[PDB]
């Protein structure tokens, strides 16, 4: 499912991400935009052999099991395919563990390079929230 911007903002709000660990909702929508272009089915393979999965491009070396990343830790205790669902609940639950891990949203490279320090409020403007 390719989400609409305001559609994704409402689903992320319902799931408790607005101001989760201090990060306002616009940060999360910006991160989804640049990590996956709002597409739940996005996957991208990395040089170390791990793969990033879903709307927030969660990585198989640490967070989910895909059966082909040697020494994967599977900290969200889910198969990575669960992260490609039209229902974003597993992606949101795992993202909450990731953002709690110490480095905050700097865990997402597209957030640090394209969202951090910009006016992220623009990502939810015009939405009925």
Curated annotation (Swiss-Prot):
In the egg white and polymorphonuclear leukocytes. It is an enzyme of class 3 (hydrolase). Disulfide bonds join 6-127, 30-115, 64-80, 76-94. Its main location: secreted. One of its GO terms (cellular component) is endoplasmic reticulum. It catalyses: Hydrolysis of (1->4)-beta-linkages between N-acetylmuramic acid and N-acetyl-D-glucosamine residues in a peptidoglycan and between N-acetyl-D-glucosamine residues in chitodextrins. It is found in: Secreted. Its EC number is 3.2.1.17. Residues 1-129 form the C-type lysozyme domain. Keywords: Allergen, Antimicrobial, Bacteriolytic enzyme, Disulfide bond, Glycosidase, Hydrolase, Secreted, Signal. One of its GO terms (molecular function) is beta-N-acetylglucosaminidase activity. Monomer. Lysozymes have primarily a bacteriolytic function; those in tissues and body fluids are associated with the monocyte-macrophage system and enhance the activity of immunoagents. Has bacteriolytic activity against M.luteus. Belongs to the glycosyl hydrolase 22 family. This is Lysozyme C.
């Amino acid at each position: 499912k390719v989400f609409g911007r305001c559609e994704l903002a409402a689903a992320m709000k319902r799931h408790g991400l607005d101001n989760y660990r201090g990060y306002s909702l616009g940060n999360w929508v910006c991160a989804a935009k640049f990590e996956s272009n709002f597409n739940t089915q996005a996957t991208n393979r990395n040089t170390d052999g791990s793969t990033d999965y879903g709307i927030l491009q969660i990585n198989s070396r640490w967070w989910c099991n895909d059966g082909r990343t040697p020494g994967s830790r599977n900290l969200c205790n889910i198969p990575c395919s669960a992260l490609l669902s039209s229902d974003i609940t597993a992606s949101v639950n795992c993202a909450k563990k990731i953002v709690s891990d110490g480095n905050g949203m700097n865990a997402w490279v597209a957030w640090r390079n394209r969202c951090k320090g910009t006016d992220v409020q623009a990502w939810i403007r015009g939405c009925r929230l």
